[PDB]
Amino acid sequence: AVPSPTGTSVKSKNFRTVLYWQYPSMSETPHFVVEVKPYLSGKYQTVSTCVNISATSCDLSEEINEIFHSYWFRIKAIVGSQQSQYVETDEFVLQKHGKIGPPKLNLSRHGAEIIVDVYHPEFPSVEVRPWMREIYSELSYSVIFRNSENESRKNFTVADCEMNECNLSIPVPSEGSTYCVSAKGHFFDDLIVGASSEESCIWVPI
16 A cells, blocks of 8 residues: 655764655655654653655754664654655664764864864754753763874863853974874763764974
8 A cells, every 4th residue: 555664764973863764756745744752751652843744854952952862763654645654764863873973163272382273063052951951961072182103192181061051271392393183072981972073183393
């Protein structure tokens, strides 16, 4: 009869979470309805922004406000008078399945001290997602300091940064060489670890 959606997939990066699926070719234009099951109720409820949509994707970022609890989602296809049944996604848990991309890293220097500005432009404002404040209070960045020639390596951590924009002043050992730096985001120490940024390098005179 009228088939259900297929190839369902939940992708979450930088707290943008989107559900995708695929659907066969239809003379009439298929429409979909997506439901979410939060952990508190353990009951499926309608995702308001994804009712009778023609798109094969749905933004879930607003339906998700628990990082440690599980969510399930399902989709059904509507074609003319008929409907399919719901197809259900794998269990979703932000802390487990959510990715954190590379931070924006800006490298500069005041004399012999290297300055590192790092953050994620993509992160939702707390004013817009208030439940998020609790998560940001556990944000920190790990910084890897690399001397391309003499070879040395060092590790730094920074946290409790205003508006999630972290800064760090690093005195260079010594001191007529090039240093390169990279960074990663961390939530709750190592519960959530992000991807490394590519290296930014900088020269330092004597």
